Ligand binder design. Structure first.
Ligand code: ADP
Ligand code: ADP
Ligand code: ZN
Lengths: 254, 254
C-alpha cells in the first residue's frame, strides 16, 4: 500500500497520517513514514520526542550525500540511483516504522537548488516506484513532492478537510492536482467534525463514494499532544472512526 | 529612454517596437534593440534579412560566454558582471541600432538552466540599470525577462493590444504584471484598428490618459513584410499614427 495524505495546514492531516501508519504497522512487515511537510512534525505526532525527531536529519540537509549522488568533476546527475540507500536516510522509530524527513524545499531566486531538489526527487521515486514496502507520505495541499512518474504508484491520495465551504474547495483542488498528475483514487477524510449539520454539509458537496470517513473533533488531541503521550491509543474515542476509515481504505485498494 | 514593448503573439507588438526604434534612431546617438520574443524576429522587421538576423547569435546560445561568466572550478556566479561586454553580444544593424537577441528561455524538468538564465538576466540588468543608451526591448504578454530590479529603470511599459474584449483583458493583465513588478507607467497602443466602432470600444474600457495612440489595420504591413522592404518607410500611411504615438510617449517620459 502506497499512500499520500494531503491537507491545508491545520486541518490535522499530519495527525491522520500518523494514525494510519500506526494502524498499518501490524498489517505490514515494514512501513516508510514520510514527512513531506516541514510545518508539522510527523515523527513527534508518531510518538517521538523533540530531540529524537530533530536527530533525524532531513533529506534537504544531507549535503555530502547530495553532492555524492548528483556527481562532480563537471558531472550533473539529476536522476541519481538511490533505492539501495534509502535506509541510510532516516531512522527506525521501532521495528516496523522507518521515518524519513523531506525537509524544506527552497526556492529562492538567486541560486541553484537543482541538485538538492533532484536528491529529494530521487528518494520519493525510490520510495514509490522501487520499494516493495508500504509507504505513507504526508504533504501540504500543493502536493508538490509528487510527479506524474511517481503518481503512477500512489494507490490512493487522501485529502483531509474540515466541514466548511472553504476547506471543501481546498479539498477539491487537491483532487484536481492529483488527477492532473494521474492519480486514479482520491478519497476524503473529514476531520474535526463537531455536529451532524456539518456531516450533512459534507454529504451534499461530496459524492458519498469518495468519502473515506469522518473523524470527530475531540479536545483529547490537543491536551494529549501537549505532552509525551501517543494520541492514537485505545483511550481516544475517535480512534474507532480511524479504524473504520482504515478498513474502507483497504477495501478500495484491495 | 528605456522602453519595454509587450503583447500577445500576433498583435503586431514586434512591428510596433521596430517602428519606435526606427524613429528613435535620429533622436539618440545609440539604441539597443532587444528581441525578447523568439516567436518573431525583431531584426528582420527592422530590415535585416533572414541570413543577417540568423548570424546574430542569441544570448541563450553563447555557451562559452555563459560558462566564463558564471564561473567554474566549483564556482557558481549567478550575478556576473557583464556591462562592459554587451557590445560583444550582438551586431550593429547600422551606425545607431545595436541588436541583441535573447533567445529561447528553457524550462524543462530534468535539468539545470540556472547558469543560462543567469546570463540572460545579467545582460537585461546591464541594459536597463548600467547603460546610458536608450533601450527598446520587446517581449510576450508574460514579460518574463523583467524583474523588480530592472523594472526600476523601465521608463514606460507599452502594452500592444487589438480592439476586442479578449485582447483588452490580455492588455490589462500586462498592466497588472508590470505594476506588481513596480513599473510606474503602463500605456496602450491599439493596433490593427479597422473602424470607429472599435475605437469606441477601446475608449470605454481604457482610461484615455493611458492610451498612447491607435494604429490602423493596413494590408501594407503584410504585402510589405513578405519581401525585403522596410514597412516603416514614409510610404506607409499608418506611419503617421506611429509618429503621433512616439511624440505623446516622449511627453510623458520627459
Ligand atoms: N480531530 C481532532 N480534534 C481536535 N484536534 C485535532 C484533531 N485532529 C487534529 N487536531 C489538532 O490540530 C492541530 C494540528 O494538527 P496537524 O496534524 O499538525 O495538522 P496539519 O498537519 O494539517 O498542519 C494539532 O493540535 C492536532 O492535535
Ligand atoms: N497594423 C497592422 N495592419 C496589418 N498588419 C499588421 C499590422 N501590424 C502588424 N501587422 C502584421 O501582423 C503580423 C504579426 O506581427 P508581429 O509584429 O510579428 O506580431 P507579434 O510580435 O505580436 O507576434 C505580421 O504580418 C505583421 O506585419
Ligand atoms: Zn540549477
Amino acid at each position: 500500500m502506497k499512500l499520500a495524505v494531503a491537507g491545508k495546514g491545520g486541518v490535522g492531516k499530519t495527525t491522520v497520517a500518523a494514525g494510519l501508519i500506526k494502524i498499518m504497522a501490524s498489517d505490514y512487515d515494514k512501513i516508510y513514514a514520510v514527512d513531506g511537510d516541514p510545518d508539522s512534525c510527523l515523527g513527534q505526532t508518531l510518538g517521538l520526542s523533540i530531540e529524537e525527531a530533530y536527530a533525524i536529519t532531513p533529506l534537504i540537509e544531507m549535503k555530502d550525500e547530495i553532492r555524492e549522488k548528483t556527481g562532480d568533476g563537471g558531472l550533473l546527475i539529476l536522476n541519481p540511483k538511490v533505492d539501495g540507500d534509502l535506509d541510510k536516510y532516516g531512522r527506525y522509530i521501532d521495528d516496523k516504522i522507518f521515518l524519513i524527513r523531506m525537509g524544506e524545499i527552497k526556492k529562492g531566486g538567486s541560486q541553484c537548488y537543482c541538485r538538492e531538489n533532484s536528491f529529494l526527487g530521487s528518494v520519493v521515486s525510490a520510495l514509490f516506484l522501487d520499494k516493495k514496502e508500504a509507504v505513507v507520505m504526508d504533504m501540504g495541499a500543493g502536493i508538490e513532492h509528487l510527479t506524474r512518474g511517481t503518481a503512477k504508484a500512489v494507490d490512493m491520495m487522501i485529502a483531509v478537510i474540515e466541514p466548511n465551504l472553504n476547506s471543501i474547495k481546498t479539498g477539491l483542488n487537491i483532487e484536481k492536482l492529483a488527477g492532473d498528475l494521474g492519480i486514479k483514487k482520491v478519497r476524503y477524510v473529514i476531520n474535526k467534525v463537531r455536529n451532524i449539520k456539518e456531516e450533512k454539509l459534507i454529504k451534499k458537496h461530496l459524492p458519498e463514494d469518495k468519502i473515506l470517513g469522518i473523524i470527530p473533533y475531540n479536545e483529547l488531541f490537543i491536551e494529549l499532544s501537549l505532552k509525551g503521550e501517543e494520541i492514537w491509543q485505545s483511550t481516544n474515542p475517535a480512534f474507532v472512526n480511524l479504524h473504520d476509515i482504515y478498513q474502507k481504505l483497504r477495501l478500495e485498494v484491495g
